[PDB]
Amino acid sequence: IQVTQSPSSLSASIGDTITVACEVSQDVGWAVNWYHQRPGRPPYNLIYTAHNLAPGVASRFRGSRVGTYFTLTINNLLPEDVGTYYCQVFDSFAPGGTRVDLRGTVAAPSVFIFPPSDEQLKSGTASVVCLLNNFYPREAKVQWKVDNALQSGNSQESVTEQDSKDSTYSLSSTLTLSKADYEKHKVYACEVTHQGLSSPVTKSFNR
Amino acid sequence: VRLDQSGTAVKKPGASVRVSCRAPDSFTVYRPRLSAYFIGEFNIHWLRQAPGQGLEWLGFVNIFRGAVKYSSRFQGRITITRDTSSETSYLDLGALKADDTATYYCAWDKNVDDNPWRLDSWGQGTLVIVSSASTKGPSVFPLAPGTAALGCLVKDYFPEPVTVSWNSGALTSGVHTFPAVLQSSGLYSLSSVVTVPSSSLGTQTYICNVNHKPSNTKVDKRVEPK
């Protein structure tokens, strides 16, 4: 039995109605269960056997079955509904769930670049950090350039949870280079693409 | 039902972990014919969630006689048992792999035929970390600066977690402490930043307070403009 959910992510305004779908690869009767997981919390049961609300779950949640196609509908969406929704059939979970967040005002990141410290450099390794601050939506693209050469495979990034008051995100990307490589080049730049930007923003320094 | 779990476990690859889950006052059911509480037929399930990923079912035990069902992905290195006198289930997972790093959950199943595999109650989770790395405190480096950004780079520590405050907790507006990333070295790194008025950079002192409990490492790093 294969279980698939869609969409993988969605943004909704407070008060909206949204629908999440769970498709099962064969008829399983009504045996689909739904779980909600708020950020940093354990999952809890939301709906069981396609359409039964778990104890204490609000009536604005509705589960439905059409054959092998199961839906979770959330009416009058509230901030407490943010998190990930998972569907389950017997021992099978989908890959990935459906991440729900709130639709904030579209806002481009404020971008900052930080050179490695001389103290770190003594260790043989250099970290360059690019900060993307207080942006919405969560999707953003960071491209590192070193003397205009596109970097690939030597960065990692991390994103905050959605802010409770302004619905924005922040992102931090670290480019990791050897000291030997760091000292062979002059211009270090992070180029940022985001829906709130008409053209990419580049912050740079010269070593 | 209330489910209580054992604490964080840090293990080397190839080692074994025993995670405990207790369901106080929930194993038994009142039976009028016996005029007493007797062991029920509930299932205790074990699941996990790796960082950033979805849920994975590992197995269950039926508490009546200890019958079990296991995921075939773990056959040969998993045992689930229950002790009815302490109302506890044990997950024993052997030959641990780095990708067994996850939060492990026990979950309660009333085992009602009309509601298959309903996991109606969940434990808080147990962090299980599997790595070749040894406990190591972080190195803390400055991220030096209308609005300016500054921060601290908390690099090369093991295991999680690290906490960060600013100015001993007196500075909270504009602070973002990011999720750690697991580097290819097997060591973690995270950054914490704060945005402040540019006009304050030469007059107000900014200190990131880094705490790494597993190594008893505390660092108060002054972040000055370069």
Author numbering:
A (entry chain L): 2 to 91, 96 to 212
B (entry chain H): 2 to 35, 35A, 35B, 35C, 35D, 35E, 35F, 35G, ...
Q: Which text from the study accompanies this structure?
A:
The highly conserved CD4bs is critical for virus engagement of host cells. To elucidate mechanisms of Env recognition, we determined single-particle cryo-electron microscopy (cryo-EM) structures of a BG505SOSIP.664 trimer unbound (2.9 Å) and in complex with representative Fabs from each expanded B cell clone: 04_A06 (3.8 Å), 01_D03 (3.2 Å) and 05_B08 (3.3 Å).
From 831 expressed monoclonal antibodies, we identified 04_A06, a VH1-2-encoded broadly neutralizing antibody to the CD4 binding site with remarkable breadth and potency against multiclade pseudovirus panels (geometric mean half-maximal inhibitory concentration = 0.059 µg ml−1, breadth = 98.5%, 332 strains). 04_A06 contains an 11-amino-acid insertion in the framework region heavy chain 1 (FWRH1) that contacts highly conserved Env residues (>99%), providing a structural explanation for its remarkable antiviral activity. To determine whether the conformation of the extended CDRH1 of 04_A06 is preorganized for binding, we solved a 1.75-Å crystal structure of unbound 04_A06 Fab. The preorganized antibody combining site of 04_A06 likely leads to a more favorable interaction with Env due to a lower entropic cost of binding.
